[PDB]
Design an enzyme around this catalytic site. Structure first.
Site, short mmCIF file in Angstrom:
data_model
loop_
_atom_site.label_atom_id
_atom_site.label_comp_id
_atom_site.label_asym_id
_atom_site.label_seq_id
_atom_site.Cartn_x
_atom_site.Cartn_y
_atom_site.Cartn_z
N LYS A 27 0.85 -1.20 0.00
CA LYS A 27 0.00 0.00 0.00
C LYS A 27 0.88 1.25 0.00
CE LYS A 27 -4.01 2.23 2.62
NZ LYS A 27 -3.66 3.06 3.88
N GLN A 28 0.38 2.32 -0.58
CA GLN A 28 1.14 3.56 -0.52
C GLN A 28 0.21 4.76 -0.39
OE1 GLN A 28 3.02 3.43 -4.29
NE2 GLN A 28 1.60 4.93 -5.19
N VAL A 34 3.60 0.77 2.95
CA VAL A 34 3.31 -0.45 3.69
C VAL A 34 3.84 -1.63 2.88
CG1 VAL A 34 1.57 -1.88 4.94
CG2 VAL A 34 1.24 0.65 4.56
N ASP A 149 -9.15 9.77 7.98
CA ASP A 149 -8.82 9.52 6.59
C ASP A 149 -9.73 8.42 6.07
OD1 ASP A 149 -7.35 9.78 4.11
OD2 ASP A 149 -5.88 8.27 4.70
#
Ligand SMILES: Nc1ccc2c(c1)C(=O)N([C@@H]1CCC(=O)NC1=O)C2=O
Lengths: 232, 178
Positions: A27-28, A34, A149
């Protein structure tokens, strides 16, 4: 001559970046990355913010520490409140790295929705998903935990997919607040993500709000603030 | 003969190997606790009745080596640090009493860490315990779920979304930032 404490700290940061070396990125975000790895026999992910090349190194360390600490507190708060989110294995404050349970085989809610929209042609069969997210975020807000978020990329569906096992992730921007305005802004961030990432799913977000409202006894002022922050 | 020990490398500290040894029917736990305080027995002497899984020990040991290389341990030695890390609280004295061993105990888990020239004489260590070494497969018969749930104050919310182990780990891994 160097201070032994500073040398030991640099050797720990070297250890951390060596561990991250060959790992696959799962993930980014804007600041964070991640990676998927293994931690003492368990499937794990490791989340880290690499210093950006245009910022002062001490500002980057402060940012990394603050968000790592907040995310570890939020994940503990989730577990003790029965809100499903990754287990924390280890938090390395020398390098601001967070080692967490990998939610194996999961798909993001984002991908699940877009898939359903492409196979089906209507959001009709997403009602149960909406109701489930409503129940989960209701519980989270009732613990006064602001996610910070909420997008459909920060919710995972743990297999078997059709069981709709929602796991919340990415609490790096979270904080504790009982104020309806803070809960209202949280929801607005999620509304905007839905509207812009999943166009023509207004009925999905509508069912989300109905479920949220019946699940939390504190929803009424929150939904009033949602109306207000959209206008401003 | 001796192959009952359980050994794992630390992923983040590849030079370090953690070893677990489990004993039942121990008759000299008072001596062992005195010896650990006099530094004449290697390793952390841990109460196995509150240990649900080896993963719990490995998380505690990883963190203890980490702080230990940083020079930032909460307690005075690596062996006490491993034990302190098992506790859900930051009360050092309370952790060492509930998770360490007393003369009242008849089961013991010894945990030690080796790296490079720092090596443990395992046969000599085992010889100091007046008791019966057993395989770690025996740990479920020794662990007491009632006692575990009391120590870690695990609730039903926690239990509704995962294992007792996962809630314990989550408690251990974040207590330094409360
Ligand atoms: N903050 C995060 C916590 C846990 C996880 C992620 C982020 C994250 O991106 N993943 C993916 C989900 C899909 C899969 O099968 N493995 C992963 O690694 C996680 O499991």
């Amino acid at each position: 001559e160097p201070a032994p404490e500073a040398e030991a700290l640099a050797a720990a940061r070297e250890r951390s970046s060596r561990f991250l070396s060959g790992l696959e990125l799962v993930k980014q975000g804007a600041e964070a990355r991640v990676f998927r790895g293994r931690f003492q026999g368990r499937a794990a992910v490791i989340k880290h913010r690499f210093p950006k090349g245009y910022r002062h190194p001490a500002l980057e360390a402060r940012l990394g520490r603050r968000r790592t600490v907040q995310e570890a507190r939020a994940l503990l708060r989730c577990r003790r409140a029965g809100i499903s989110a990754p287990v924390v294995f280890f938090v390395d404050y020398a390098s601001n790295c967070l080692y967490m349970e990998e939610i194996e085989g999961s798909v993001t809610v984002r991908d699940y929705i877009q898939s359903t929209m492409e196979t089906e042609k209507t959001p009709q069969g997403l009602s149960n998903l909406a109701k489930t997210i409503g129940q989960v975020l209701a519980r989270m807000h009732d613990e006064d935990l602001i996610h910070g978020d909420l997008t459909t990329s920060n919710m995972l569906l743990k297999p078997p997919l059709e069981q709709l096992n929602i796991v919340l992730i990415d609490f790096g921007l979270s904080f504790i607040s009982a104020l309806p305005e803070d809960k209202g802004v949280d929801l607005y961030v999620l509304e905007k993500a839905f509207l812009s990432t999943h166009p023509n799913t207004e009925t999905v977000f509508e069912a989300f709000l109905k479920s949220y409202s019946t699940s939390s006894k504190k929803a009424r002022p929150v939904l009033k603030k949602l109306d207000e922050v959209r206008l401003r | 003969g001796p192959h009952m020990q359980l050994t794992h490398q630390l992923d983040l500290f590849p030079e370090c190997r953690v070893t677990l040894l489990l004993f039942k029917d121990v008759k000299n736990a008072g001596d062992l606790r005195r010896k650990a305080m006099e530094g004449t027995i290697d390793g952390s002497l841990i109460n196995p009745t509150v240990i649900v899984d080896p993963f719990q020990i490995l998380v505690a040991a990883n963190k203890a080596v980490h702080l230990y290389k940083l020079g930032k341990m909460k307690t005075r030695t690596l062996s006490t640090e491993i034990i302190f890390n098992l506790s859900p609280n930051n009360n050092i004295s309370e952790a060492l009493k509930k998770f360490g061993i007393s003369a009242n105990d008849t089961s013991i888990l010894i945990v030690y860490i080796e790296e490079g020239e720092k090596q443990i004489n395992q046969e000599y260590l085992i010889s100091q315990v007046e008791g019966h070494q057993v395989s770690l497969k025996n740990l479920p018969e020794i662990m007491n779920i009632t006692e575990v749930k009391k120590i870690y104050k695990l609730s039903s919310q926690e239990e509704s979304i995962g294992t007792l182990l996962d809630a314990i780990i989550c408690r251990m891994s974040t207590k330094d930032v409360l």
